[PDB]
Design an enzyme around this catalytic site. Structure first.
Site, short mmCIF file in Angstrom:
data_model
loop_
_atom_site.label_atom_id
_atom_site.label_comp_id
_atom_site.label_asym_id
_atom_site.label_seq_id
_atom_site.Cartn_x
_atom_site.Cartn_y
_atom_site.Cartn_z
CE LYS A 283 4.15 2.04 10.21
NZ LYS A 283 3.67 3.12 11.13
CG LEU B 39 -2.12 -1.00 1.08
CD1 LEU B 39 -2.90 -1.09 2.40
CD2 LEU B 39 -3.04 -0.60 -0.07
N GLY B 40 2.01 1.25 0.64
CA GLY B 40 2.91 2.40 0.68
C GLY B 40 4.24 2.14 1.38
N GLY C 20 7.99 4.42 3.06
CA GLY C 20 8.70 5.65 3.39
C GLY C 20 9.36 5.53 4.77
CG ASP D 38 4.59 12.99 10.94
OD1 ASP D 38 4.73 14.12 10.42
OD2 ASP D 38 4.93 11.98 10.28
O1 LIG Z 1 -4.16 1.13 7.49
C1 LIG Z 1 -3.92 1.60 6.31
N1 LIG Z 1 -4.79 1.40 5.28
C2 LIG Z 1 -4.25 2.04 4.15
C3 LIG Z 1 -4.68 2.17 2.82
C4 LIG Z 1 -3.91 2.89 1.89
C5 LIG Z 1 -2.69 3.50 2.24
C6 LIG Z 1 -2.20 3.41 3.54
C7 LIG Z 1 -2.96 2.70 4.45
C8 LIG Z 1 -2.72 2.42 5.88
N2 LIG Z 1 -1.56 2.86 6.46
C9 LIG Z 1 -1.12 2.84 7.79
C10 LIG Z 1 0.14 3.41 8.08
C11 LIG Z 1 0.59 3.50 9.42
C12 LIG Z 1 -0.25 3.03 10.44
O2 LIG Z 1 0.07 3.08 11.72
C13 LIG Z 1 -1.49 2.50 10.14
C14 LIG Z 1 -1.94 2.41 8.83
#
Ligand SMILES: O=C1Nc2ccccc2/C1=N/c1ccc(O)cc1
Length: 274
Positions: free
Chosen positions: A35, A12-13, A15, A135
């Site tokens: 994660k 999903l991402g 960084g 943040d």
């Molecule tokens: O839970 C998520 N669903 C998504 C759908 C698309 C892109 C990013 C995310 C998420 N990112 C997270 C990043 C750090 C966190 O502590 C918790 C979720």
């Protein structure tokens, strides 16, 4: 235990927070986010209530964990040889606020009001749980598109809330306050309010107001989009140079611009076509 409980999906991402994949709890087909954080990249470590070495991020997530949907919920976690894996809840469909603004440009104020209001409730729950996020920004807010509910994510730069001065910070510089830029000192609440001002400007103008250190310390706000005087006033108030001149959360939510907020479902029906 193990990875026989979850089925890994697409990335999903990635960084400074690590790498997050879409997943599915095999036991009940529950949407989750997996994660991965490398141990070498974890600078901030904390101790669990029972007493164990885990990322501060885990400590913080547990402290904000409740039935309140305004903050992402940590459902489980695991320690691996050189990394930690966190199982987080995953709304579906979802779009983060940065992508939402990128596509839709500047938000109509009624929408910004509903979004800002939910972030305020979310930040307040964090502080009430004794957690400072450090943040707050559009990339760290998720929009549950069906329910019109926002969720604050990524507690990887946070810290236990405290009344004393913070001399450390590894959040986003363009959301960081003039007192951090000039003195490497800030207090939690007022720093939070400063970033909330950056977020609101971002929402109603479609971009952050300050890109350089020079601009942050000057604290001069120029509105590039048409924005109501009430909204401009609150933004300007949140971006006061002197931390003590900034509004409390109570003052922000009592501001005239924040009155008559839409409920989340109403927000989805009008603006997220749900
Ligand atoms: O839970 C998520 N669903 C998504 C759908 C698309 C892109 C990013 C995310 C998420 N990112 C997270 C990043 C750090 C966190 O502590 C918790 C979720």
């Amino acid at each position: 235990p193990l990875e026989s409980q979850y089925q890994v999906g697409p990335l999903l991402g990635s960084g400074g927070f690590g790498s997050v994949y879409s997943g599915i709890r095999v036991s009940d087909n529950l949407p989750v986010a997996i994660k991965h954080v490398e141990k070498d990249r974890i600078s901030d470590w904390g101790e669990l209530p029972n007493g164990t070495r885990v990322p501060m991020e885990v400590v913080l997530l547990k402290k904000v964990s409740s039935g309140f949907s305004g903050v992402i919920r940590l459902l489980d976690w695991f320690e691996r040889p050189d990394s930690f894996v966190l199982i987080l809840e995953r709304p579906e469909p979802v779009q983060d606020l940065f992508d939402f603004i990128t596509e839709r440009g500047a938000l109509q104020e009624e929408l910004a009001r509903s979004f800002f209001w939910q972030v305020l409730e979310a930040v307040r729950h964090c502080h009430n749980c004794g957690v400072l996020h450090r943040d707050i920004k559009d990339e760290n807010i998720l929009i549950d598109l069906n329910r019109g509910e926002l969720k604050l994510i990524d507690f990887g730069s946070g810290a236990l809330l405290k009344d004393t001065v913070y001399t450390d910070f590894d959040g986003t510089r363009v959301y960081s306050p003039p007192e951090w830029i000039r003195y490497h000192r800030y207090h939690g609440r007022s720093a939070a309010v400063w970033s909330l001002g950056i977020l609101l400007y971002d929402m109603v103008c479609g971009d952050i107001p300050f890109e350089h250190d020079e601009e942050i310390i000057r604290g001069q706000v120029f509105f590039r989009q048409r924005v109501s005087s009430e909204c401009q006033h609150l933004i300007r108030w949140c971006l006061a140079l002197r931390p003590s001149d900034r509004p409390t959360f109570e003052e922000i939510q009592n501001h005239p611009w924040m009155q008559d907020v839409l409920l989340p479902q109403e927000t989805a029906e009008i603006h997220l076509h749900s």
